[PDB]
Amino acid sequence: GYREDLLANRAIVKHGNFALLTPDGLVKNIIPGFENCDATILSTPKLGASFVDYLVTLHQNGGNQQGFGGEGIETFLYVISGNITAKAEGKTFALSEGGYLYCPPGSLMTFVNAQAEDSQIFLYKRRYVPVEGYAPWLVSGNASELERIVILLDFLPKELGFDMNMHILSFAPGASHGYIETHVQEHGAYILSGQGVYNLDNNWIPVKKGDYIFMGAYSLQAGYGVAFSYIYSKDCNRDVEI
Template sequence: MGYPKDLLSSRSMIEHGKYALIAPEGLVNNTIPGFENCITSILGSPKLGASFVDYIVTMQEGGKNREGFGGQLDIETFVYVIEGKIIAAADDQQFVLEESGYLYCPPGTKMYLENIEAGESKLFLYKQRYRSLEGRSPWVVSGHANRIEYRNYDNMHNVNIKDLLPTDLDFDMNFHILSFDPAACHPFIETHVQEHGAYLLSGEGMYNLDNKWVPVKKGDYIFMGPYVQQAAYAVGRENLTYVYSKDCNRDAEL
């Protein structure tokens, strides 16, 4: 970027254990073993207060992960293609994923990634420790979000949602895409035990984080911890849309 031409400033906001808004302008490259020709930034993590780890990965031409991502017996992983085109592989299966493509790998299954775009491909990457349930086990899931139909969110015609993973009890989390038409909003300010890691795919809005309204836009990352009040208004001329994770299908632990 070169030398600064103005006072240093940032839109990012961090409240450890509660919430975070991380603007793309402040991201730095983290060297992650196994990722070649990749610019990788760690977003949400246990150091922030999250129970998972989120990454934004820009795979440059020839970028790949030959060693595999995840694979531990209690770690599940997920990748979502923001832009570009990759090959994602798991359990001797290969998937060509373009924009909106995704792959979920259950515990014990390594995920292999390779950029096949002439330029760069950008990925939203995730890992979490799986909470097992007797008699249940998840499986490899892949698809493209753009091929899944939206449904109304909480019976509102101007807010829509889609599930990227099955809602079966075999899965202890899900990824969703939530989209607000211009001027749409949540039906109420949510307060719940679940936590989220969200990447904004399009639009602009105002987001309530712990009862503080902050402006957000495409390219931002938001972490929302358990019981943090949260809601959004869409502003501007295009939909406010984001992909996000949510823990589900399990009881609270003592």
């Protein structure tokens, strides 16, 4: 049989713990402000996340010219593929694959497909948490130009001004290393490329390009290549308010 039919139907959920979503096999979301593009909402508080993230494929002139952000809301955009034109804080950014844009609270973001063919984007937003004597700021660039800490990438500054960060993990084929972790902090991962196997709630699940995974608070993760790379969020630098 076709390797594909085998991997058909993997969308599993364990609210608050984890969820494997396959945005493909999902109904599109009609979100005001988004024109000529298919938007599909992923993690949301109703799933337990303290953020909302999206996967959006932009058709010709697809994007959001209305302004994505919101008051007290910070956002982050990542060009999965194609070319778009983002705008924020009066500036303009020509983002190509790997191009990213972070906006501090308040600085609405707009973006549109900059090419003829479809451009695919990954969106993320959360309610920013201010701390005395600090503040975040607009950050933009391309993954290519990022440090190369297997390879870990840190998209945002580590300063307390920031209360979150986006990362990309890559695993070359002949790799002998794998991913693992336990955490109080949630995670939202979108598999950028390759194919691998994850171990969420003690069960192995083949994972692949296009898949999305919600790792809830207080969960154990693990995965390995089989180039396997994925982008993922992570809140940080903050105490827990009660």
